[PDB]
Amino acid sequence: SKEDEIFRIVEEKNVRFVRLQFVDVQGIPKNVAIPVGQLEKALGPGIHFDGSSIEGESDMVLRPDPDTFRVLPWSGNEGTAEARLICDIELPDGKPFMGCPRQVLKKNMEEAAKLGYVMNTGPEMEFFLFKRQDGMPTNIPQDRGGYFDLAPIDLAEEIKREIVLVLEEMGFEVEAAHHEVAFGQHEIDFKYDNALATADNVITLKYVAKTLALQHGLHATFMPKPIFGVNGSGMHTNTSLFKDGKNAFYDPDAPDQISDTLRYFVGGVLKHIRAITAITNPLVNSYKRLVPGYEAPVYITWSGPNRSSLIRVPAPRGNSTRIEIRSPDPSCNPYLAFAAILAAGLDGVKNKIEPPERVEKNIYKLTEEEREKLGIGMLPGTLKEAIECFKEDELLVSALGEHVSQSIINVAMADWDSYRTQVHQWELDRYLQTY
Amino acid sequence: GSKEDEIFRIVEEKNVRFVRLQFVDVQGIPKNVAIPVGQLEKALGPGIHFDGSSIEDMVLRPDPDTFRVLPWTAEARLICDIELPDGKPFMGCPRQVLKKNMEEAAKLGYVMNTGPEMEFFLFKRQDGMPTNIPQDRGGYFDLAPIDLAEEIKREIVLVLEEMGFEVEAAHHEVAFGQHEIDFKYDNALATADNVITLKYVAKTLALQHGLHATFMPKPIFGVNGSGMHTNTSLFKDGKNAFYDPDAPDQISDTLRYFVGGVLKHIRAITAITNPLVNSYKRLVPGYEAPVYITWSGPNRSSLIRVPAPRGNSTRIEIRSPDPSCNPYLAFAAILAAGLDGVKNKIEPPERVEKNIYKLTEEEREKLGIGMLPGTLKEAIECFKEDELLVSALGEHVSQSIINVAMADWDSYRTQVHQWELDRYLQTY
Numbered sequence: 001s002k003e004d005e006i007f008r009i010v011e012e013k014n015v016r017f018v019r020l021q022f023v024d025v026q027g028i029p030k031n032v033a034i035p036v037g038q039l040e041k042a043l044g045p046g047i048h049f050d051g052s053s054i055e056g057e058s059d060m061v062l063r064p065d066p067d068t069f070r071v072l073p074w075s076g077n078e079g080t081a082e083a084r085l086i087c088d089i090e091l092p093d094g095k096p097f098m099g100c101p102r103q104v105l106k107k108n109m110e111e112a113a114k115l116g117y118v119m120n121t122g123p124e125m126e127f128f129l130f131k132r133q134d135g136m137p138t139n140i141p142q143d144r145g146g147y148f149d150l151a152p153i154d155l156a157e158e159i160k161r162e163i164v165l166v167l168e169e170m171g172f173e174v175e176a177a178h179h180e181v182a183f184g185q186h187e188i189d190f191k192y193d194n195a196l197a198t199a200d201n202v203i204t205l206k207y208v209a210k211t212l213a214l215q216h217g218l219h220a221t222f223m224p225k226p227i228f229g230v231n232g233s234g235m236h237t238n239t240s241l242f243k244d245g246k247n248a249f250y251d252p253d254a255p256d257q258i259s260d261t262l263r264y265f266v267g268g269v270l271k272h273i274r275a276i277t278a279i280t281n282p283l284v285n286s287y288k289r290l291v292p293g294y295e296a297p298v299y300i301t302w303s304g305p306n307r308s309s310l311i312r313v314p315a316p317r318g319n320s321t322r323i324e325i326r327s328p329d330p331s332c333n334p335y336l337a338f339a340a341i342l343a344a345g346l347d348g349v350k351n352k353i354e355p356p357e358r359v360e361k362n363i364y365k366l367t368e369e370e371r372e373k374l375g376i377g378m379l380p381g382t383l384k385e386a387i388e389c390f391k392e393d394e395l396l397v398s399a400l401g402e403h404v405s406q407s408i409i410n411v412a413m414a415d416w417d418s419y420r421t422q423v424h425q426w427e428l429d430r431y432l433q434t435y
Numbered sequence: 436g437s438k439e440d441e442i443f444r445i446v447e448e449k450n451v452r453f454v455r456l457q458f459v460d461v462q463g464i465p466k467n468v469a470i471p472v473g474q475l476e477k478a479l480g481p482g483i484h485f486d487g488s489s490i491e492d493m494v495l496r497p498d499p500d501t502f503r504v505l506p507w508t509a510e511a512r513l514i515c516d517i518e519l520p521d522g523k524p525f526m527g528c529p530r531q532v533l534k535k536n537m538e539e540a541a542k543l544g545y546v547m548n549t550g551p552e553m554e555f556f557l558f559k560r561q562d563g564m565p566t567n568i569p570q571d572r573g574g575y576f577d578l579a580p581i582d583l584a585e586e587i588k589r590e591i592v593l594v595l596e597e598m599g600f601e602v603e604a605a606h607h608e609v610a611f612g613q614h615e616i617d618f619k620y621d622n623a624l625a626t627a628d629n630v631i632t633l634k635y636v637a638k639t640l641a642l643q644h645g646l647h648a649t650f651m652p653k654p655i656f657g658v659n660g661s662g663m664h665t666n667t668s669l670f671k672d673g674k675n676a677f678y679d680p681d682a683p684d685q686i687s688d689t690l691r692y693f694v695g696g697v698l699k700h701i702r703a704i705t706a707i708t709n710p711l712v713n714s715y716k717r718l719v720p721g722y723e724a725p726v727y728i729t730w731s732g733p734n735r736s737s738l739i740r741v742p743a744p745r746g747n748s749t750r751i752e753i754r755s756p757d758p759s760c761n762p763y764l765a766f767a768a769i770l771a772a773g774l775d776g777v778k779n780k781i782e783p784p785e786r787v788e789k790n791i792y793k794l795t796e797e798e799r800e801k802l803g804i805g806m807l808p809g810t811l812k813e814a815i816e817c818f819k820e821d822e823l824l825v826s827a828l829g830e831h832v833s834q835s836i837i838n839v840a841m842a843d844w845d846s847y848r849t850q851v852h853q854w855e856l857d858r859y860l861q862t863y
């Protein structure tokens with residue numbers, strides 16, 4: 001069994017401490033550190049803890065996933081190694097805790113598997129590497145590099161090289177990495193995999209990047225818009241659906257070689273996109289990224305590979321047929337982001353929802369007067385606007401569960417009510433002298 | 436004319452060498468053309484030419500009744516009306532807008548009297564630049580040495596009295612370094628001229644003492660914000676149209692209809708009376724600023740409050756405006772909405788005597804209690820649809836308000852504030 005193999009790696013690598021990882025409703029990693037003597041208990045009856053943290057009655061159990069056992073490559077003190085285990089949350093009786101984000105994606109994937117569907121995701125993870133002043137993080141870029149720039153213009157080549165190496169040691173396959181448009185911005189794209197593996201790997205990337213950045217006196221951040229006037233970090237999600245082993249989005253006889261299932265999936269996602277934005281763009285800062293002038297999509301449209309739209313259908317066909325949903329940012333909870341896209345996309349397929357016409361023209365160049373005539377909508381401008389749209393979307397509330405949906409609304413409203421009352425420096429700079 | 440002869444007599448007496456031809460833009464900011472006293476005869480006669488882009492070729496028409504010597508050789512002031520080169524009045528001038536709305540009210544025998552309570556802050560200056568640090572650590576109705584600004588306030592009131600200004604009283608307000616100067620009531624035009632003069636005088640005397648006076652609605656987070664509570668009454672043929680000794684609470688039907696009209700268009704009026712992005716950081720619960728759309732007697736802090744004094748002192752206190760508003764437009768908007776209430780006989784909602792702030796949301800839902808706009812864009816969208824206020828203020832003024840407010844909102848919306856970095860940078 002897998003448990004035997006885990007104990008074999010423990011003795012071989014001299015593992016002494018194990019981190020029982022899990023994630024709250026906001027995508028923040030949480031854990032319980034246990035000595036290796038308690039590993040047998042963790043894989044058996046499980047370890048008890050207070051699940052108040054998940055919300056961000058109290059007694060809950062951690063159920064480690066044996067497939068996620070990985071040794072942390074940063075060797076601990078004096079040859080003693082550390083290991084991690086991604087855990088599912090269960091109630092004391094044994095039934096799964098429906099408030100756990102990982103359980104939510106698992107449920108939505110099981111409902112898709114009933115209809116022979118399996119969703120594969122391949123995200124493009126953008127992030128910034130900032131300097132640290134007096135031990136505290138800042139928003140000052142480490143390098144003054146631009147798109148696909150090379151060293152010495154790109155100073156973060158060593159750290160990025162270490163990130164990709166550390167990931168490959170943990171059964172991770174990376175496609176390519178490069179410097180992005182903004183100063184100190186970078187991107188690491190990894191290959192497609194099932195939504196659950198992908199979500200686990202997204203959490204691991206953020207953890208690894210932030211850990212290795214601190215080792216070099218830097219701070220890695222996946223914040224959507226840390227600097228005004230420059231490009232913001234996005235999480236473009238390449239998505240494809242696979243029915244009975246074959247790619248359900250490929251039809252060689254249909255026009256553009258795009259199957260009917262793809263058009264319905266796009267139609268479903270675009271129908272609930274205003275509600276999905278509350279999950280995929282969950283911070284108040286996420287809406288400072290959704291502004292015109294940068295690579296981020298703001299208008300609700302879909303097109304081919306020759307236009308920067310919300311959904312893009314790349315040229316590659318065959319097994320690589322897919323859609324690139326470009327609205328999410330890397331601060332979203334990946335477990336809930338993929339669950340929301342899968343539920344909206346499958347409703348598209350089930351109800352045969354036809355998507356709008358493919359806008360191939362440049363949407364920013366088109367006049368606002370013409371957009372209303374075509375029928376082109378806009379994504380929510382504020383977090384409150386997206387939460388109000390999410391609150392009404394009965395499908396996403398049921399797909400994510402009432403517990404998770406309520407927690408998202410409570411956290412977002414608490415942040416919005418605090419942000420809206422604040423007096424920002426822009427207001428003093430604009431009015432104090434004159435008024 | 437003899438007002439002109441009177442002006443030249445004061446010139447020779449106080450040895451006045453320069454005259455300021457003051458006027459105001461759509462945003463209530465004072466603008467002026469400095470001319471030597473040799474050109475004063477030309478200003479009072481054919482007028483002085485200037486580029487009209489500032490209000491958002493025109494002539495300045497000084498009002499001889501507004502000639503005042505600046506108490507700080509000697510300098511003098513003249514509030515001017517704007518006209519186009521041919522002679523017709525410029526309908527984009529804020530002072531001309533209030534005059535037009537007052538003339539329309541006068542044709543129906545009505546005259547509006549306003550008495551504002553002007554709140555403001557006095558802040559320290561660091562390296563010749565203004566800050567939001569209170570000069571004093573005082574509180575409501577506080578006395579020296581807790582109130583360190585009693586000498587500046589003393590000078591403000593004094594200087595104002597030297598320019599034909601009657602001040603009712605002055606006191607320290609709730610927040611640190613906040614003060615209030617309430618002056619007697621007068622017709623909407625004289626009051627709006629007086630409001631502009633106060634702001635000019637207070638900011639000038641504050642600089643003389645190395646301080647900075649500001650009429651910003653919410654310069655500091657977590658403390659009280661500055662408001663402009665406007666005491667308003669309507670007069671019909673010399674008598675107070677709001678007093679009826681036989682009616683309940685001794686309030687006339689005209690008061691209830693005027694209140695009904697103001698409350699009907701209050702969401703649109705907020706774009707004029709609360710015109711800055713910062714104005715909506717003041718319209719938050721927990722401070723003396725009204726947020727819910729209600730009207731009540733003197734025992735409750737509501738949007739409209741009907742004080743106990745009766746007879747000729749019958750009035751309503753509209754507490755939603757802030758002192759950063761253009762007074763010429765703020766009074767014109769209130770007069771037009773209030774007169775539509777009187778005209779169309781619009782009944783106001785039931786007076787809410789309970790403490791709204793303590794009431795549950797589900798309760799307010801039953802009472803049908805509305806909320807004021809939460810953002811500047813939200814108020815501008817409501818103002819854009821209010822056909823009455825757009826016609827009352829004129830298409831030129833209404834368009835200019837919308838253009839300046841959306842330019843500010845589109846710049847504010849895209850900005851990344853420090854709060855966001857403090858909240859997300861370390862964790863995400």
Ligand SMILES: Nc1ncnc2c1ncn2[C@@H]1O[C@H](COP(=O)(O)OP(=O)(O)OP(=O)(O)O)[C@@H](O)[C@H]1O
Nearest residue numbers: 120121122175189190191192238239240319320322
């Ligand atoms: N079928 C798919 N479903 C979801 N994502 C995909 C799919 N194919 C590729 N992607 C994602 O798109 C990115 C680039 O696509 P790519 O052109 O490399 O496809 P590929 O040539 O078949 O190689 P790979 O399968 O490793 O992505 C990758 O990071 C990957 O995660």
Ligand SMILES: Nc1ncnc2c1ncn2[C@@H]1O[C@H](COP(=O)(O)OP(=O)(O)OP(=O)(O)O)[C@@H](O)[C@H]1O
Nearest residue numbers: 548549550603617618619620666667668744748750
């Ligand atoms: N008819 C009115 N309309 C608007 N405001 C008024 C009116 N009467 C008084 N006020 C305001 O009330 C303040 C004084 O309060 P109060 O009304 O109790 O005294 P008053 O004797 O009735 O009026 P005043 O102080 O002007 O002589 C003044 O600053 C004035 O601006």
Ligand SMILES: [Mg+2]
Nearest residue numbers: 124236324326
């Ligand atoms: Mg891309």
Ligand SMILES: [Mg+2]
Nearest residue numbers: 554608615723
């Ligand atoms: Mg007060």
Ligand SMILES: [Mg+2]
Nearest residue numbers: 552664752754
């Ligand atoms: Mg008051």
